[PDB]
Amino acid sequence: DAVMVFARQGDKGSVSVGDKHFRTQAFKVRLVNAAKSEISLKNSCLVAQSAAGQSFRLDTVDEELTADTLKPGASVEGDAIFASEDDAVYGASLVRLSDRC
Amino acid sequence: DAVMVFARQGDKGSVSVGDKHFRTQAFKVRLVNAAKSEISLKNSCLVAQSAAGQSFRLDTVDEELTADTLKPGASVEGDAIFASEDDAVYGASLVRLSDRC
Amino acid sequence: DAVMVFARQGDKGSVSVGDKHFRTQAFKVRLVNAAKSEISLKNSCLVAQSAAGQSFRLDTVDEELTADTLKPGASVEGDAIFASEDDAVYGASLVRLSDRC
Amino acid sequence: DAVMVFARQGDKGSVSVGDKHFRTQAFKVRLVNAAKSEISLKNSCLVAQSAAGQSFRLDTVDEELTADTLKPGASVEGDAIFASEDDAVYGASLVRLSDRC
Numbered sequence: 281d282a283v284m285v286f287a288r289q290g291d292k293g294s295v296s297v298g299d300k301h302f303r304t305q306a307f308k309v310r311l312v313n314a315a316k317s318e319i320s321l322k323n324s325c326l327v328a329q330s331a332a333g334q335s336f337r338l339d340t341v342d343e344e345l346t347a348d349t350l351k352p353g354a355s356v357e358g359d360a361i362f363a364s365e366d367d368a369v370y371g372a373s374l375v376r377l378s379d380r381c
Numbered sequence: 382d383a384v385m386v387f388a389r390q391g392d393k394g395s396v397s398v399g400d401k402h403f404r405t406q407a408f409k410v411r412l413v414n415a416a417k418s419e420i421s422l423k424n425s426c427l428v429a430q431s432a433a434g435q436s437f438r439l440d441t442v443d444e445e446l447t448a449d450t451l452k453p454g455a456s457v458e459g460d461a462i463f464a465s466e467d468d469a470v471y472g473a474s475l476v477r478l479s480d481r482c
Numbered sequence: 483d484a485v486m487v488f489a490r491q492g493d494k495g496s497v498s499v500g501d502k503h504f505r506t507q508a509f510k511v512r513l514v515n516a517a518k519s520e521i522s523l524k525n526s527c528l529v530a531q532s533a534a535g536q537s538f539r540l541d542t543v544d545e546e547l548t549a550d551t552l553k554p555g556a557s558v559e560g561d562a563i564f565a566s567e568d569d570a571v572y573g574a575s576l577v578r579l580s581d582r583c
Numbered sequence: 584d585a586v587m588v589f590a591r592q593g594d595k596g597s598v599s600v601g602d603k604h605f606r607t608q609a610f611k612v613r614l615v616n617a618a619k620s621e622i623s624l625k626n627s628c629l630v631a632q633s634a635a636g637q638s639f640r641l642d643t644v645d646e647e648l649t650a651d652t653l654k655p656g657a658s659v660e661g662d663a664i665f666a667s668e669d670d671a672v673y674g675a676s677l678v679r680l681s682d683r684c
Contacts, residue, residue: 282399289393292491296578298484303533303575331404331467366533367575373404373468376397383601390595432606432669474606474670477599494592498679500585505634505676568634569676 283319283350284312285326287375290359295339304339305369310357311377313350322348325381328362328372336372339363384420384451385413386427388476391460396440405440406470411458412478414451423449426482429463429473437473440464485521485552486514487528489577492561497541506541507571512559513579515552524550527583530564530574538574541565586622586653587615588629590678593662598642607642608672613660614680616653625651628684631665631675639675642666 290306309326313319326345329335342358350356362369391407410427414420427446430436443459451457463470492508511528515521528547531537544560552558564571593609612629616622629648632638645661653659665672 285395285397287395287397292575294487294489294576296487296489296576299578301576301578367573370575371468373393373471374395374397374402376400376402386597386599388597388599472670474595474673475597475599475604477602477604494676496588496590496677498588498590498677501679503677503679569674572676 281315281317281319283321283377284314285376286310286312289373292370295363302339302363302365303367303369304361304363305336305372306359306361307375308357309345309360309375310355311345311347311350312355313352316352318349318351320349321377323381324377324379326360326375327378328360328369328375330368330371331373334368334371336362336364336369382416382418382420384422384478385415386477387411387413390474393471396464403440403464403466404468404470405462405464406437406473407460407462408476409458410446410461410476411456412446412448412451413456414453417453419450419452421450422478424482425478425480427461427476428479429461429470429476431469431472432474435469435472437463437465437470483517483519483521485523485579486516487578488512488514491575494572497565504541504565504567505569505571506563506565507538507574508561508563509577510559511547511562511577512557513547513549513552514557515554518554520551520553522551523579525583526579526581528562528577529580530562530571530577532570532573533575536570536573538564538566538571584618584620584622586624586680587617588679589613589615592676595673598666605642605666605668606670606672607664607666608639608675609662609664610678611660612648612663612678613658614648614650614653615658616655619655621652621654623652624680626684627680627682629663629678630681631663631672631678633671633674634676637671637674639665639667639672
């Protein structure tokens with residue numbers, strides 16, 4: 281009765297504007313409903329984090345990953361790009377769903 | 382009189398379901414029998430490990446790598462994906478055959 | 483009223499001549515003027531740096547990235563390759579524009 | 584009056600046979616004679632090393648990189664794969680020519 285989250289580490293990068301800087305870590309994410317009922321994602325969000333429990337904000341995400349619900353057997357996929365001001369986001373090793381959004 | 386194991390580090394990733402999380406390290410593996418006799422793999426398994434001797438469970442493996450035997454000169458290849466709950470598996474640097482399966 | 487700098491970490495490398503050695507980190511860089519006025523880059527330069535503020539010299543850069551100005555909505559892109567004598571440049575995680583050139 | 588050595592870090596890997604294991608780091612190497620005279624490479628060899636000066640044996644190399652000489656303007660390229668028993672070779676960041684072969 282929970283959505284399955286598959287992530288693969290992608291490109292590392294940065295964004296700078298004047299003296300405002302941040303680092304980025306991209307993941308290719310696939311969400312899969314392997315249960316027998318429709319699961320709502322409306323009050324859920326994607327969080328990337330280190331094994332120590334440090335989490336990182338989502339900077340940009342492909343529209344497909346923001347589906348409100350996932351019917352049984354349905355799958356959505358796309359890129360999700362997380363950020364930190366420093367280089368901490370490079371240690372993000374897990375993408376998961378939170379309901380604290 | 383042992384099978385040769387060639388591995389190349391591939392993608393780093395993760396799998397999450399509810400609050401059950403793990404990290405993944407993929408390798409492309411090739412097994413080669415460079416001896417003069419057939420070698421049995423029936424009671425052998427692929428293990429990934431760090432240089433310090435810490436080993437990691439095999440989460441998924443391509444069917445081709447689970448051949449029961451390898452005749453002389455035979456070669457099989459495919460992906461093998463190992464896991465840890467935390468990010469330890471990212472230090473797996475060796476794939477080898479164990480007979481403790 | 484500042485140019486936006488998008489960078490993605492690319493190849494790691496080295497250059498050696500006799501006993502003169504250095505390490506290289508490439509980035510794909512895109513510069514974007516998202517403001518309403520033309521912005522001059524004539525006295526600006528690309529700097530790569532670590533989160534701790536350690537910066538690295540630019541060894542080579544694609545001609546497209548050395549435009550003197552960027553009109554509104556204009557974008558230029560190319561590779562930029564930064565260097566260190568030791569392996570410090572591998573921790574460069576940000577490309578930004580400096581006006582101290 | 585020295586050959587120029589350009590290297591780019593490639594795949595990380597391993598080789599195992601029975602309980603004999605090693606780790607591998609591949610580089611794409613290009614050798615370039617940018618001088619005005621023919622330079623002999625007959626008593627030279629490719630060495631990979633860390634910034635601290637730790638060096639690693641050459642396990643395999645493409646035939647093209649073992650040219651005996653390089654005439655003016657000549658260039659040769661190919662892959663070179665270096666090894667360590669443990670995972671030290673993963674810190675090799677420089678390929679250079681030695682005359683101690």
